[PDB]
Amino acid sequence: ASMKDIYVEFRGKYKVDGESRDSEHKGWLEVNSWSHNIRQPKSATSSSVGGHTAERVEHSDMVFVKDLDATSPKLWEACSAGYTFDEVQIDFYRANGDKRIKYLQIKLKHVLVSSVTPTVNEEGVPTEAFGLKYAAVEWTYNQQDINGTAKGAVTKKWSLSNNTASYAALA
Amino acid sequence: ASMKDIYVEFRGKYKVDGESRDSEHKGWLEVNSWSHNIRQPKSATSSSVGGHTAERVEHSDMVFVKDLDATSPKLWEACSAGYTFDEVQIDFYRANGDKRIKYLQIKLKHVLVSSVTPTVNEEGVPTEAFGLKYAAVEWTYNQQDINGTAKGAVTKKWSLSNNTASYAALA
Amino acid sequence: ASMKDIYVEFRGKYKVDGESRDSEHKGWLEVNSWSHNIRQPKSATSSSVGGHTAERVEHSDMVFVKDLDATSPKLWEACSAGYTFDEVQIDFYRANGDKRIKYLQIKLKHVLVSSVTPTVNEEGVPTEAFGLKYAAVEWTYNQQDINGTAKGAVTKKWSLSNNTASYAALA
Amino acid sequence: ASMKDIYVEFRGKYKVDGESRDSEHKGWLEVNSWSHNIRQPKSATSSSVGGHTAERVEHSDMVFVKDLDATSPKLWEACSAGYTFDEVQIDFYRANGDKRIKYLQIKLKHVLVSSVTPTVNEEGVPTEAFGLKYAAVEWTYNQQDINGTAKGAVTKKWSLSNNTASYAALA
Amino acid sequence: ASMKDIYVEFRGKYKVDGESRDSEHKGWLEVNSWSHNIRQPKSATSSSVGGHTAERVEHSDMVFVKDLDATSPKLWEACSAGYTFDEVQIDFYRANGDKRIKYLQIKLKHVLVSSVTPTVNEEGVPTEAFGLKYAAVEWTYNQQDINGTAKGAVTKKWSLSNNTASYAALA
Amino acid sequence: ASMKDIYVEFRGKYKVDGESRDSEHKGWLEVNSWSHNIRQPKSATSSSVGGHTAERVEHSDMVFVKDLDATSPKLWEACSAGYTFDEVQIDFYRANGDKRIKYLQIKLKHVLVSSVTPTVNEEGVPTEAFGLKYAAVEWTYNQQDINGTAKGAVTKKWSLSNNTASYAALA
């Protein structure tokens, strides 16, 4: 059984409350897909004489696709206004034998809706893409052993605003 | 039963009266599809020292596709002349069990036809794309409960001319 | 029964006499398809202080596709020479129950062949695309009632050379 | 029966003798397809005060596709050297009931091979595209009546080097 | 039987320990595909008067595609931070009758993760592309005789940082 | 029976010895496809007053696709180093009834590997494209009569370094 599901929750002063009725994500947004891109310009053939490298990594926006729903106008206005959210969390699920597993969890700190792109076609459920831009990110991947049983998590992080491996927006 | 339908009405001094015979949209335009794009350039890693952020959101034109019909020359001339309409309303429908639901309603204030792109091919019903540019927008999404019964509406808005969350073109 | 047909007639000093044997369009060109584009740059968020707006609409060429035939060299030479035609008329037909209807009629005033693009492939009837550029246009769409019976025509027009809604090239 | 065939003959000091064994085109090149493009920049909304218009038409190269054969190295060298040919003739054939008809004939005056693009793939007969650039062109289209019987030819021409409707390279 | 498999191991201060349970690559990353590009600008029609040629080869990043797994956040952070690895080794396998053969082995010296591009779609196993940039490379191709039996290896190398055929990053 | 085959031999100080076991090409590289492009900028509507034309032909690299094999690292290093080869020969074969014919032979003088682009995918035999840049070329096409029996060869040539029809790199 496929048990794929992705859920998003906004946490800030402005509310983007979703429609999900999943017991573990009541009021979260249900989304269909996710894509990202990270690009590091640092040279492998030149090095700084000292401890300062000018360039830094570029993180692209995280882009999600979702069905149009009651959260859509909320996203459209939030994008237009440039409202900042303290945190956004995204949980990713897949099948794990008899129950699902949250294999990936992403937390974004100091977040804006950078784009929304809605369409209604003649055929098919209407959908929109939306992008998120952020100051810091914490990624957690949940491992399992050969029996599919949960082993330890791998947690990594990056602060674009501090240029350090921290889940922190401020200095 | 699929009950998809999109209807557009122009409201201004210049008439773009449509062909629809739908009881609830007599004389509106029937259209086939819609697409939009909203892009916010605001940074998540830098902030203004004060309360002024230079950049603002960019709303792309709202683009509709429709069959060529008697409104087509009206659109072609309105686009050519750059006539402004006080308001344009778009109603979006889908199935809701035994009757249809208007799941999305968009009102645009101070509107121009920014483009029209008609084609007649050897095969298929002739169609055209047309785009609308506007000073302000009000979006209403009509929610339903788990039984499909109407719950409360979500209404949001944005004024490009005022740079505020208002359905107003003028200051 | 599909009764799709498009006919073009050039009216000027230089003759581009066609091959059609249709009783109502003897010697017109038979063409297969048509495409156009109209783009209005006027802003919806800024307005002139006075009555003058700098920019004007851009009409793209009207582009037609036709089978290669005896008119082809006539088009190739007319395009090369830049001959101007006083008028070009295009009639568009579709089925209307037992007889066809001219649903769209376009008249172009002060017209040049702006491009011709012929091909002969290994397979298929050879065809060419050709484009027309013009000073003014009159568009007529022929309406029908719910019984398919002719109702009134919708006629609109635009003069690119006068920047007014007129079917006139000269001032 | 399809009787499609295109034949090309070079006429100049440098020989590009072909492989055809067709009785009417012995030693011509057999080619598979042809494409061209003619673009006229003249405005329909502005006119010269006098009798001089600056811009002129742009004729693209005539591009042919053919199987690789013994003429291929001849084309490759002629293109490399920039050899000029006094004339190149191209005859185009299609079915006409019981016999074929030369529906199109093109003569090019003062001609260069402007490009050659050969490929050998794992599958399929190797082919190359080649382009011809020229000073003047004469196009002849052979008409037929409703019975398919030959009627009169349509002959048109253009000199790029003289900017007149003449089949002449020199002044 | 297809026995295709590609394995990657990072060797540096920062750990990117993988998930593989293959007996010969325990804890390596399993990857699905690889692509590269090498471009030499040196002219064949001009030569230096002396022994110095200005330009040098450009090696593109080596790009791998892999399933998302517990190493993914490790790659995302390593790319973000620009961590350098002393060495990365990649082993490539295919079938060789009754057992597999390592037909290609690549060692990269002084290596950075230059890009990572993860996606989760509605359908299909989530994957990411990642790119590696490096100072030097050693390529080993393992040959076999007509009986499929191992013959001698072909080993070649290049140092981008020294511009010589050496597997060395430093001078 | 298809008897398509392409073989390449490098002849220079640096060895790029191939894997072929074909009796007539022992140790040559077997390749799968070939593509080229030759472009002549000379005008057909303007001519030099004297005997000097500034521009010259541009030959693109000759691009080959081959399976990855033991020659691959040799190509990768040769490209990286910019090694020059005195000559490279390419023989092209197709079926000729009961035996194959070498229909095309290309010799390149003073040659560099200008690019190599290898890929290993999940499915399919790994392949690479490689390009060759050169100072001169001799092309030989082997003709046959209507009975498929060998007739005379057509040999043509071009020197990019001398700008003459010669198979010579040096002056």
Numbering used by the authors:
A (entry chain A), B (entry chain A), C (entry chain A), D (entry chain A), E (entry chain A), F (entry chain A): -1 to 169
Kindly provide excerpts from the paper associated with this entry.
Hcp (haemolysin conjugated protein) and VgrG (valine-glycine repeat protein G), products of the genes tssD and tssI, are the homologues of the bacteriophage tail gp19 and the tail spike complex (gp27)3-(gp5)3, respectively. Based in this analogy, these proteins are thought to be molecular markers of a functional T6SS and they may form the needle of this secretion system. Significantly, all of them are composed by a β-barrel forming hexameric rings oligomers with a diameter that can accommodate small folded (< 20 kDa) or unfolded proteins. As described in 2013, many species within the Acinetobacter genus (including non-pathogenic ones) have a conserved and functional T6SS that contains homologues of 12 core T6SS genes, including the hallmarks tssD (Hcp), tssH (ClpV) and tssM.
We also present the structure of Hcp from A. baumannii AB0057 at 1.55 Å resolution, characterizing its self-interactions and oligorimezation. Conversely, the C-terminal tagged Hcp crystals diffracted up to 1.55 Å, the highest resolution as yet reported for a molecule of this type. The Hcp structure revealed a tight β-barrel domain (12 Å diameter) formed by two β-sheets that are comprised of 4 and 5 strands each. There are three molecules (0.1 Å RMSD between their Cα atoms) in the asymmetric unit that are packed in a down-up-up fashion, with a distance of 30 Å between chains A and B (head to head arrangement), 20 Å between chains B and C (head to tail) and less than 10 Å between chains C and a symmetry related chain A from the next unit cell (tail to tail). The average contact area between intra-ring molecules is 1325 Å2, with 19 inter-chain hydrogen bonds. The inner diameter of this donut-shaped hexamer is 40 Å and the outer one is 80 Å. Although the A. baumannii Hcp protein forms a nanotube, its packing is unique among these structures, as the 3 chains interact both head-to-tail and head-to-head within the same crystal.
